[PDB]
Design a protein around this nucleic acid. Sequence first.
RNA 1: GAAGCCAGAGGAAACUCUGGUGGAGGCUCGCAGCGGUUCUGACGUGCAAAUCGAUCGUCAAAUCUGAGCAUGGGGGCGAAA
RNA 2: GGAGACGACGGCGGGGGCCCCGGGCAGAGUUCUCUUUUCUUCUUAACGGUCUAUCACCCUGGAAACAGUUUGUCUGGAGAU
RNA 3: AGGGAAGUCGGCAAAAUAGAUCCGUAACUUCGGGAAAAGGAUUGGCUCUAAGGGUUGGGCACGUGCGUGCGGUUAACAACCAACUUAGAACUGGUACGGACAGGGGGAAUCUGACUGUCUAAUUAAAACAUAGCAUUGCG
RNA 4: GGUAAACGGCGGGAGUAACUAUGACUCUCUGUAGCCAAAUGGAUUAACGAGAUUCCCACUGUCCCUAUCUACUAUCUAGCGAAACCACAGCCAAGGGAACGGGCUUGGCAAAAUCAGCGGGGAAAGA
RNA 5: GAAGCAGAAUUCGGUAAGCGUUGGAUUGUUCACCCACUAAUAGGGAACGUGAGCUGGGUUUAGACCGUCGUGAGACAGGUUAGUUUUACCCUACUGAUGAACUCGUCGCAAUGGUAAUUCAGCUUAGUACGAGAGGAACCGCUGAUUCAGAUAAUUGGUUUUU
RNA 6: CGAAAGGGUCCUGUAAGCAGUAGAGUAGCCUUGUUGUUACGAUCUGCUGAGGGUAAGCCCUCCUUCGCCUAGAUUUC
Lengths: 43, 101
Amino acid sequence: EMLARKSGRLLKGGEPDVDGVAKQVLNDFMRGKIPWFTPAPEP
Amino acid sequence: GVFAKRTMTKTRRRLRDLDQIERDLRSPRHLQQYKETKAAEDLPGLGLYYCIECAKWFESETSLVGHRKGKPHKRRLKQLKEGAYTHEEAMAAIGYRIDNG
RNA sequence: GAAGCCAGAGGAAACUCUGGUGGAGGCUCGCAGCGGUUCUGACGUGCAAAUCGAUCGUCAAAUCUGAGCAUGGGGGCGAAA
RNA sequence: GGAGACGACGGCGGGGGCCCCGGGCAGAGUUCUCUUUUCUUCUUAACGGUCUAUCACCCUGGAAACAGUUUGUCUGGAGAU
RNA sequence: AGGGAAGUCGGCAAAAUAGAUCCGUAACUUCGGGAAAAGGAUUGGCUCUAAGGGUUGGGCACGUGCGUGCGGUUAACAACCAACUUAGAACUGGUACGGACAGGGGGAAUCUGACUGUCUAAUUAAAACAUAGCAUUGCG
RNA sequence: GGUAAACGGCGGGAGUAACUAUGACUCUCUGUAGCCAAAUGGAUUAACGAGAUUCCCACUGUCCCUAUCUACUAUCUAGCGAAACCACAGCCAAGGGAACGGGCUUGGCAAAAUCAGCGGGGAAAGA
RNA sequence: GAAGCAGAAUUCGGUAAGCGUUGGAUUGUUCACCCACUAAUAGGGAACGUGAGCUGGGUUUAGACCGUCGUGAGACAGGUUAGUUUUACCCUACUGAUGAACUCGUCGCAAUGGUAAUUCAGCUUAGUACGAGAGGAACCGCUGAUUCAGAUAAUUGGUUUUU
RNA sequence: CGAAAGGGUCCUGUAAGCAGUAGAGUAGCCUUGUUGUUACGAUCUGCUGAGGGUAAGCCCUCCUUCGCCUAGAUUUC
Ligand SMILES: [Zn+2]
């Protein structure tokens, strides 16, 4: 909701577009725009 | 201008009635039930900016204050000053009354 | 709303900020013109051997266009199909 | 040596014509009511005379406490006001 | 009507949006843009109010309408003339107020060609062609 | 003899006895956000597009599931008046070796002359 | 009809085509499988033993790109994008509509052709039969609904050139 | 039977015009404000469920009016 209000992803009546913002976040996660990794197991 | 004027009279496009707004102004419990039938996170400004007379939510306090100067708000005020039409007025128009003993 | 210019506030100055002015661009919405995207479109012995309607691209320029003149088939011309 | 003789675009100023407003004479229409009303004519060529019209140029004089000045910041001891 | 893409290969087609004033406007970016992003508030009529202009015009002493020598910047005043914008307020009708007309649907992304431009007149307008930029070769 | 080293070939690294090209013969090879570089470490490239694709909101007759209205036709009349196509013709069923019947065989049947429509068949695609 | 088939729910089989046999999702694909509703979501033919209804894929003229091959023109293991067939007024069939001859008309008959309904639920039976318990029917009777069919316009919606 | 008309039934929504100590305000004239007054002024109120329409596929009307009438032509056991 805060990401939608900040980025202006609003439906009619100023309601936040939580669906579209979730799709944006998932796409950024998959396409290497958010840093993440699985650490290797310690020997 | 009215958005999508063609389907304006559909039941799924219905707005709150003037007698309901009168009861909202008189009693905060009635308004509280009406606001309970909504979700606060889906409302403009998280529901913090509400005009009872127009039964409308606004995105900001400055938006609400600016709306108060317009003629739709003044038309609603004039209609409330004239008084909403009720079943009591309808009964009095034909001279019918209720006998409760 | 580009350079250039004026004022005010700073800054040792170079410069910075604010408000104006100005009117640049193979910039943009869009009328005519030019073009020709779409539609189970009209038409299909048609108004027409390529037309009609709506919609669409472009619209100050690598824009549109007249007349005069030049290039001629082993050729010409070709932002090349 | 000059004229013939020369691009495109932008805003600014002058002039003609058109458009618009008011008064007046004449004509026409409207008129249940209202409307001193609504409409129409009221023009002046080429060619000449005469008086004037931005730029620019000339004379006096010598500008800082710089000044003049365009919507647009150009001009001035190479002489500004 | 009610539902709202359940239709269909596919939202094809239609609908919705649309002028103007104001509030507000993210990522990305070649820092120029994106942008009219997005999302909101408003708009009729009538009666008023306020703001924004032009022209003309200064007192003495002499000579006699001009010449001087002065004196003064409350003309901050009068007289006359004139047009269109802008803002503010009350009142008032309403189912409608850009009332017809005119007039962006918007957004998240992927592929693709840098862009503006050009061609298969009469089935293909495009990742095709061109373009600026870059690189090579020949020639005194 | 030298290369645009363009095409092309090209698993490396050491040695030597060859001794120059071709060698040849052995050996052996597996930071939950840093460091280094002249702020950045990029093509995951902005803008632009009647280019191709997926999705969301809004929207609606796309659909459930159809109904109704208007104009012009179609229709009927007066006038005017073509063309395509055409062996001959046009109801079917079963059989008719060459997997074909409209005409033959055997049955069903079968009654003048017509009008509006329709798209099974025959005709109909500059086929 | 048969089965340890108590009841309920079924399973195997017989006669039977009278009557039904649905709505969606999914194309990084042999589109086949999932989801639900339901009484049930059976299978085929009349095309595919070539073949003019409409419209998508196998699919493929001319433009274009990438991959593989080729010295090249070009070809393909391939992948992508965009792309011209446009009757009916004829005969027959079918659906409707007239009709000559028998004077005109009214009331009838009925050969022949067509033919139509369907499924579920609820109340009662009954918490009964049956059952250790959990559970748990049916015939007669009654009332609705599903799908189909034929009408109709009092009412409610829709439609407005009643301009 | 037809054309009008009248009555009914429906549809819309209160006609034109006149008037009003209704009307935000503004400007004049004077009693300089005492509805001061007059003028203008969206609108409002009254006359006024008024006005307009009503079969074109609505109803009634010997007894509200006007008109029309025993044809013409063709054919027939
Ligand atoms: Zn309000």
